[PDB]
């Protein structure tokens, strides 16, 4: 299983780091990371990790301006892509198909190859434009997994919420997060 992990400059960099950490604990999974310029800023602000620390969580890390990277090619097989978190700018770019950098190009390629795209859109409030773009991509089979907190499993800390979101994102690829707190009835 080869997964692309795009990270983007929406607040919620801890979500990306945690997903990358959980992926690192699965040996059957090769990860290709692309951090946008603004994701690097957000990682540094919101987590104790640097961008290089996060890059080291992945098997491969590609430059966001590098349209000649492996994952820019359709013939280079992957099982899909997660953008976490996904900003409104990146969301809008993917919907329009304006593949100006590698996050956008890798996403455009994933879609043309029929591979799974999972977005973790984060913004509040959501406007009509945000919702239009989300719907357009949803109709195409793109999974929309905003980081909405669950309270039924009695979370206490931010980590509790992050890990639940990560588990529910991973569900999209039939992957089992080993600390998921699921509904029992």
Ligand X SMILES: Cc1cc2nc3c(=O)[nH]c(=O)nc-3n(C[C@H](O)[C@H](O)[C@H](O)COP(=O)(O)O)c2cc1C
What size, in residues, is the chain? 185
Residues between 137 and 176 that touch ligand X (CB under 6 A): 152
Residue 128 main-chain phi, psi, to 5 deg: -60, -40
- Closest residue by Cα to residue 36 from 9, 61, 70, 57: 9
Applying CB under 6 A, which of residues 1, 11, 26, 60 lies at the interface with ligand X? 11
Pick out the residues of the known binding site for FMN. 9-11, 36, 87-90, 122
Applying CB under 6 A, which of residues 15, 39, 120, 165 lies at the interface with ligand X? 39
H or E, element range at 163: helix 158-170
Query: From the CB of 170, what's the least distance to its own copies, in Å?
Result: 11
For residues 65 and 36, what is the distance between their CA atoms, to the nearest angstrom?
9
Q: Total residues contacting its own copies (rule CB under 8 A)? A: 85
Pick out the residues of the known binding site. 9-11, 36, 87-90, 122
CB 79 within 8 A of CB 2: yes
Residues between 73 and 132 that touch ligand X (CB under 6 A): 87-90, 99-100, 105, 122-123
Three-state SS at 60: strand
Residue 132 as a binder of its own copies (CB under 8 A): the answer is yes
Applying CB under 6 A, which of residues 68, 131, 135, 158 lies at the interface with ligand X? 68
Applying CB under 8 A, which of residues 19, 54, 161, 170 lies at the interface with its own copies? 161
Task: Find tokens 């966001």 and name the residue.
Answer: 64
DSSP state of 42: H
Q: Total residues contacting ligand X (rule CB under 6 A)? A: 23
CB 102 within 8 A of CB 64: yes
**Residues forming the site for ligand X (CB under 6 A):** 8-11, 36, 38-39, 41-42, 45, 67-68, 72, 87-90, 99-100, 105, 122-123, 152
């Amino acid at each position: 299983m080869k997964l692309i992990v795009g990270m983007t400059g929406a607040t919620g960099a801890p979500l990306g780091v945690a997903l990358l950490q959980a992926l690192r604990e699965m040996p059957n999974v090769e990860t290709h990371l692309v951090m946008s310029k603004w994701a690097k800023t957000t990682i540094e602000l919101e987590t104790p990790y640097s961008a290089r620390d996060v890059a080291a969580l992945a098997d491969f890390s590609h430059n966001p301006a590098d349209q000649a990277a492996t994952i820019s090619s359709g013939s280079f097989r992957t099982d899909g892509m997660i953008v976490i978190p996904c900003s409104m700018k990146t969301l809008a770019g993917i919907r329009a198909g304006y593949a100006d950098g590698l996050v956008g190009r890798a996403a455009d390629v994933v879609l043309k190859e029929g591979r799974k795209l999972v977005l973790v859109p984060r913004e509040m409030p959501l406007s009509t434009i945000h919702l239009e773009n989300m719907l357009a991509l949803s109709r195409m089979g793109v999974a929309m997994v905003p980081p909405m907190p669950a309270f039924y499993n009695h979370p206490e800390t931010v980590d509790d919420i992050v890990h639940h979101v990560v588990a529910r994102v991973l569900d999209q690829f039939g992957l089992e997060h080993p600390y998921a707190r699921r509904w029992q009835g």
